[PDB]
C-alpha cells in the first residue's frame, strides 16, 4: 500500500516519484520537439498506475506541452496526480518563480502544482533576482495556494542557510542527486537536511544502474543488489529505491518502460531489513562517487560525497 512522507507543513507527499518528464529519447545531432513517445508514458502512466502519481517536471525540461496533453487527455482526477514542478534558475526561461509558474499553470492546464522548486542555487547572470527575494516568491506562491508546497533543489548546506536566515516558511523539500554511490551531493547535505526536517529528495537514485563499471560482475555492491533481488523477487532498481526510501528520503525516478514504473510505484510491496539497509549503505559508500547532474558545479565536492 502506498507510503507517503509528511512534511514540516503537515502536508502529504507520496514517497516515490515514479514519472519524470525530464528524459525522453534524443538524437545524437539533435531539437527543442514535441516527444509523442513522452506524452505516451506519462498518460499511460496516469491511466494505469494504482494510487496518487507523483510527476516530476522542470520548467528546464522543456516538456510542459507534453506533460499538458497527457494531463488533458487522462481521466485520472487532479486530486490523485501530485506534480512537482521546479523554476529554472541555473538558465533563465522566465524572469521569476511567479512569472514561470503562471506559464507552467497555462501549458499545464491545471490551477495549482502540489510542489514547486528552485531549481538550482546558481543563479543566472541575466536573472534579476537573487535566491532571497527568489524564495520570498515561492513564499507567496504557496499563500496564494498556486503552490501547495515549496522548496529547493540541488542546495548546499550554506544555500539553505541563506534561505533559512529569511524565511518565514521553512524550505520543505530539497531535492538532491542522492544514491549508493553519491551520498552526500555536496558536504553534510543529508545530515543538515533531516536534521532541520527538510525532506531530501533523491534524484537519479538508480544511478549505479545508469552507469555500472565494467568489472560490476566482481564487484560486491552488484552482488549484493543481485541477491536481494533474488531474496525479494524484486528488480535491483525496486530495492535501490526502497533503499532510498529506508534511509528517510523520497526517490525520484523515470523509466522509458511502463512496466518499470509500475515496479517503482510498487516498492511498498517488500520491506528491506536494517541490515540489509545498512549493508547496501556501507558498499556503497566503499564505491568511488558517481555524480550525473550539476557535475560541472559540484565535481569539486567528489572528495566529501562518500564520507
Known amino acids: 500500500n502506498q507510503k507517503f512522507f509528511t512534511l514540516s507543513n503537515g502536508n502529504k507527499i507520496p514517497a516515490v516519484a515514479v514519472v519524470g518528464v525530464g528524459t525522453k529519447w534524443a538524437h545524437a545531432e539533435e531539437d527543442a520537439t514535441f516527444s509523442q513517445e513522452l506524452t505516451d508514458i506519462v498518460k499511460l502512466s496516469l491511466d494505469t498506475v494504482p494510487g496518487i502519481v507523483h510527476i516530476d517536471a522542470a520548467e528546464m525540461y522543456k516538456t510542459y506541452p507534453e506533460l499538458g496533453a ?3 487527455e487522462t481521466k485520472k482526477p487532479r486530486e490523485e496526480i501530485f506534480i512537482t514542478d521546479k523554476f529554472s534558475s541555473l538558465h533563465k526561461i522566465s524572469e521569476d518563480p511567479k512569472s514561470a509558474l503562471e506559464t507552467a499553470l497555462n501549458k499545464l492546464g491545471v490551477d495549482y502544482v502540489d510542489l514547486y522548486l528552485i531549481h538550482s542555487p546558481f543563479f543566472d547572470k541575466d536573472l534579476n533576482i537573487d535566491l532571497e527575494t527568489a524564495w520570498k ?15 529547493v533543489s540541488n542546495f548546499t548546506v550554506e544555500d539553505l542557510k541563506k534561505v533559512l536566515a529569511i524565511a518565514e516558511i521553512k524550505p520543505q523539500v530539497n531535492q538532491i542527486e ?3 554511490f553519491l551520498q552526500n551531493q555536496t558536504p553534510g547535505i543529508v545530515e543538515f537536511s533531516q536534521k532541520n526536517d527538510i525532506l531530501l529528495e533523491a534524484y537519479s537514485p538508480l544511478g549505479p544502474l545508469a552507469k555500472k563499471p565494467t568489472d560490476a ?3 560486491p555492491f552488484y552482488q549484493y543488489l543481485k541477491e536481494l533481488s533474488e531474496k525479494y523477487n524484486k528488480t535491483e532498481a525496486q530495492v535501490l529505491l526502497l533503499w532510498v526510501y529506508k534511509r528517510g528520503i523520497l526517490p525520484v525516478t523515470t523509466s522509458a518502460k511502463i512496466e518499470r514504473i509500475k515496479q517503482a510505484q510498487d516498492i511498498f510491496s517488500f520491506d528491506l531489513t536494517e541490515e540489509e539497509v545498512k549493508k547496501i549503505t556501507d558498499l556503497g ?3 568511488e562517487p558517481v555524480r550525473l547532474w550539476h557535475v560541472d558545479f559540484y565535481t569539486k565536492y567528489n572528495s566529501e560525497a562518500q564520507k
Not at 516568491?137 to 522548496?151: D, H, R, T
Open 285 to 287: 559508500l566503499q564505491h
Open 178 to 180: 542522492f544514491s549508493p
Open 217 to 219: 560482475d566482481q564487484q
Open 70 to 72: 497527457a494531463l488533458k
Open 137 to 151: 516568491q515561492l513564499e507567496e506562491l504557496y499563500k496564494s495556494g498556486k503552490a501547495k508546497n515549496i522548496g
